[model samples]
Target: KLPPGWEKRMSRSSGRVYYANHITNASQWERPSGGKNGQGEPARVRCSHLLVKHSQSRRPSSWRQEKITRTKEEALELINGYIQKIKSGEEDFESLASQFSDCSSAKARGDLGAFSRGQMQKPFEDASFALRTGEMSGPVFTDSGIHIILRTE
Candidate 1:
């Protein structure tokens, strides 16, 4: 839709649409009106995490195994146990994750590296964004499995 003599037209040859103003002889492929063409809020966040996989995972296998037989409840219990070990303030995420995380990021002590927006699974990314840098999260669920995140940047 347009105001007055302004109209939207389609090109059979270019197969793209363009806007035209018949009254003023003005036309362009880009829209005539748009709002907020620049960035809004923060678009990126960085994090690390330890993942625990269960049989219900989208891919039940991980770097740790060819298959997973544990149930979601079982995996949650195991991860929660890990939470306490870290919560005790005596153990380190690096050592613990290096030894037990099912994700290959374990080799780098659960370092999934830098990412932005929807690159990560929804709940995981949302949790990451929610944290202050250097903050750790409780368990969060995703199709990959359960995770505990550390917002590194």
Candidate 2:
């Protein structure tokens, strides 16, 4: 049940639309290598899509989103802390990320190079949005993992 003014925007702009038959067919490429492909590892080589056929629906927008935001002061403070640690040679990005981040980028110092605000998660969005050019932020949590952004003008 959508709340008041909890609009749904569809094809054009419809907060929510009730549909009877909404079928989606998705098929991932079956890895075809006993050894490997061009990448030397198993990877999808064909169309992979979601199959949402033969499903009945009543409610709309049932998906839940976790929105987390922080104050500008807190975000700025975190950035300062991260910068201090790296500048003092106390720890590197990769080191801290691997120990703290929860995603694969944890292997690479939480680097999500050249990303826009909307491209990142909420907490990350807050930090990135707050930083100035050539600034490095501390850890900010997103669905993907923690982020320590280095903003560029």
TM-score of 2: 0.35
Give all TM-scores, in the order shown.
0.71, 0.35
Superposed by TM-score, candidate 1 places the C-alpha of residue 25 at a distance from the truth, in angstroms, of 58
Colliding pairs, model 1: none
Best by TM-score: 1
The residue-by-residue lDDT of candidate 2 on 6-124, one tens digit each, is: 22333335533422111111011222123222232112111100111111211111112123243444444544565568657897655655554334444444455555445544555
For all candidates in order, the CA lDDT equals 0.76, 0.37
lDDT of 1: 0.76
Candidate 1 lDDT, 1-153, residue by residue in tens: 344335799967786698765432334566654445432325677777888999999999987889899999999998888888987876878778898899999999888878888787777876776655776777888899888887788
| Candidate number achieving the greatest lDDT relative to the actual structure | 1
Residue 93 error, candidate 2, Å: 2.0
Model 2 — which ten-residue stretch has the worst lDDT?
A: 46-55
